[PDB]
């Protein structure tokens, strides 16, 4: 209802989807995704349209819509 479904594209083009509220700070998504890869979150960078997602960003603040895509990149050196 205020939820939207997001596809998180990981580095192997595998996908995990999250249903989150438009107002949810996106840190939970990052922490859940990094936990499921068995990797440190700070080894990862979560991008929405190339732009880094902060712990306090929300889907609404970022302008996310239904089925929008987050890409998970390896963090840079």
């Amino acid at each position: 209802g205020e939820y939207i479904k997001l596809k998180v594209i990981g580095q192997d083009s595998s996908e995990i989807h999250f249903k989150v509220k438009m107002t949810t700070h996106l840190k939970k998504l990052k922490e859940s995704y990094a936990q499921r890869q068995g990797v440190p979150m700070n080894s990862l960078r979560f991008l929405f349209e190339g732009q880094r997602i902060a712990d306090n960003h929300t889907p609404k603040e970022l302008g996310m819509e239904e089925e929008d895509v987050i890409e998970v990149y390896q963090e840079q050196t």
Binding site: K5, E15, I16, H17, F18, K19, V20, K21, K28, L29
Partner: peptide, 10 residues
């Protein structure tokens, strides 16, 4: 390769 949906709590 199956679909994976996680529901997150606010």
């Amino acid at each position: 390769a199956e679909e994976r949906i996680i529901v997150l709590s606010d």
